Design an enzyme around this catalytic site. Structure first.
Site, short mmCIF file in Angstrom:
data_model
loop_
_atom_site.label_atom_id
_atom_site.label_comp_id
_atom_site.label_asym_id
_atom_site.label_seq_id
_atom_site.Cartn_x
_atom_site.Cartn_y
_atom_site.Cartn_z
N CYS A 381 -21.07 -12.06 32.01
CA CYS A 381 -19.78 -12.68 32.26
C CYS A 381 -18.79 -11.63 32.75
CB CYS A 381 -19.25 -13.38 30.99
SG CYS A 381 -18.80 -12.27 29.64
N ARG A 386 -19.23 -13.53 26.55
CA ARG A 386 -19.74 -14.86 26.83
C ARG A 386 -21.21 -14.83 27.25
NH1 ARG A 386 -15.55 -16.77 31.20
NH2 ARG A 386 -15.74 -14.55 31.72
C1 LIG Z 1 -13.90 -6.81 25.98
N1 LIG Z 1 -12.75 -7.54 25.36
C2 LIG Z 1 -12.85 -7.37 23.87
C3 LIG Z 1 -11.48 -6.91 25.82
C4 LIG Z 1 -12.82 -9.07 25.75
C5 LIG Z 1 -13.76 -9.89 24.87
C6 LIG Z 1 -13.98 -11.28 25.36
C7 LIG Z 1 -13.61 -12.51 24.81
N2 LIG Z 1 -14.04 -13.51 25.66
C8 LIG Z 1 -14.64 -12.91 26.67
N3 LIG Z 1 -14.62 -11.57 26.53
C9 LIG Z 1 -11.42 -9.69 25.79
O1 LIG Z 1 -10.86 -9.76 24.61
O2 LIG Z 1 -10.92 -10.10 26.82
#
Ligand SMILES: C[N+](C)(C)[C@@H](Cc1cnc[nH]1)C(=O)O
Ligand SMILES: [Cl-]
Ligand SMILES: [Cl-]
Ligand SMILES: [Cl-]
Ligand code: NA
Length: 425
Positions: A381, A386
């Site tokens: 993703c 995801r």
């Molecule tokens: C990689 N981080 C933790 C910054 C992401 C995790 C995430 C949640 N849904 C998709 N990705 C975010 O919080 O945007």
């Protein structure tokens, strides 16, 4: 008052297109968990999952219609007990479903007789129910558990308040930043994972039960991932399994499934009981992780494909999907598998109670796009959260070659020479 179908009449109805067999029990029993000590867990072959606890939710009729269960069909309900189907049968009649019958002899007549067809999640024992977690922390005898060392982990993303607001008793919190670096947003180095896993009291011989708390993420907030606790728990499950933890469990539905079962919670700040050594080479399962170099090869081979587990606005390049990702676009050649509304929701892979979607419905949608266990699949993703949830769903099915493209669109778009597509396909 409700009609009843005999076991022979049900055996004759197996395979018909007009008949719909509906498992009223919980999703965990439907997946294969022997909740009542039956000889054989799972569901009648071809049955669908519609737990009776969904009756108290106003979206029940919408869930039924979304599963394409129409009044034209012959409804056959069953559970551990025919009286457990009485409430569901009445609700079906009150909503225009006139052909509703109750199968009275599923347990133990169908479960004990192996001549009757039953299906189950192949790796259901990694998707644990709340009752199993409660028995584990209580030292009681539980099925599908033969270990002596366990730890319950509450996953979160820069939000210990998700842990301190209420957690499973005895559990400890693990910030997702302990296992993934904010620079690459990929899994950390083996030396970093070794130190991080040891400091949290996790060894390779340890049974790690992971779970997160859903606190309604909003795309307009600064760090919406702080509320996507269960996605991070599955993301941490992938990293630990990739690292070398052999027994990794995930609480089906997350923190809500614990409280929905009537189990009390704790607000203590439990200190970490560190361990001196992890006890296995990291990574012991390198197959689970795929990087950008291997990802480009899988795009060229018919033997492999990459599965884009992103939202629709991200796929057409309307938005990047994140407040920390600049480029908007999609990797060319990847198979699109829409995750949900935005980057912090997994509606297409979850029920309204955040438990995993009926795995039969998932593999049917995947099959229509070419996502099949015959191929080596690397889900991805934006950064990997995801993609890890979709990868865990396929791993529960027993697919032999499923992986996670850790880099995702973030690493792909960080290189200006990588191709990308935009707009409606
Ligand atoms: C990689 N981080 C933790 C910054 C992401 C995790 C995430 C949640 N849904 C998709 N990705 C975010 O919080 O945007
Ligand atoms: Cl059928
Ligand atoms: Cl979540
Ligand atoms: Cl993409
Ligand atoms: Na990543």
């Amino acid at each position: 008052g409700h009609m009843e179908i005999t076991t022979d009449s049900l055996l004759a109805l197996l395979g018909s297109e007009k008949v719909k067999i509906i498992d009223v029990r919980s999703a965990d029993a439907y997946n294969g968990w022997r909740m009542r000590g039956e000889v054989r867990g799972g569901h009648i072959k071809g049955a669908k999952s519609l737990p009776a606890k969904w009756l108290t939710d106003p979206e029940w009729l919408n869930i039924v219609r979304f599963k394409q269960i129409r009044p034209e069909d012959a409804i056959v309900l069953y559970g551990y007990t025919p009286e457990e189907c009485e409430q569901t049968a009445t609700r079906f009649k009150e909503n225009g479903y006139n052909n509703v019958s109750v199968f009275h002899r599923f347990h133990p007549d169908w479960t004990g007789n192996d001549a009757f067809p039953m299906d189950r999640l192949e790796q259901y024992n990694r998707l644990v129910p709340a009752e199993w977690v409660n028995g584990l922390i209580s030292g009681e005898e539980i099925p599908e558990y033969d270990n002596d060392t366990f730890i319950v982990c509450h996953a979160h993303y820069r939000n210990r308040d998700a842990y301190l607001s209420g957690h499973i008793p005895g559990a400890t919190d693990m910030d997702t930043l302990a296992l993934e670096s904010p620079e690459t947003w990929n899994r950390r180095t083996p030396e970093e994972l070794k130190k991080a896993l040891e400091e949290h009291g996790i060894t390779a011989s340890t049974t790690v039960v992971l779970y997160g708390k859903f606190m309604h993420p909003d795309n307009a907030d600064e760090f919406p991932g702080s509320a996507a606790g269960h996605i991070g728990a599955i993301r941490l499950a992938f990293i630990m399994m990739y690292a070398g933890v052999e027994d990794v469990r995930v609480l089906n539905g997350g923190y809500q499934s614990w409280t929905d079962a009537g189990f009390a919670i704790s607000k203590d700040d439990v200190p970490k009981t560190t361990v001196p050594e992890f006890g296995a080479p990291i990574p012991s399962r390198p197959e689970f992780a795929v990087d950008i170099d291997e990802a480009k090869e899988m795009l060229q081979s018919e033997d492999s494909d990459l599965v884009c587990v992103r939202s629709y606005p991200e796929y057409i390049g309307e938005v990047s999907g994140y407040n920390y990702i600049a480029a908007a676009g999609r990797i060319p050649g990847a198979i699109f598998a829409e995750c949900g509304s935005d980057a912090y929701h997994m509606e297409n892979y979850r029920n309204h109670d955040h438990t995993t979607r009926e795995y039969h419905e998932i593999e049917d949608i995947w099959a229509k796009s070419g996502i099949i266990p015959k191929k080596h699949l690397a889900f991805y993703c934006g950064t990997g959260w995801r993609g890890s949830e979709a990868w865990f769903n396929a791993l529960l099915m027993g697919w032999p070659r499923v992986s996670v493209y850790d880099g995702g669109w973030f690493e792909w778009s960080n290189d200006p020479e990588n191709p990308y597509e935009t707009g409606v396909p």
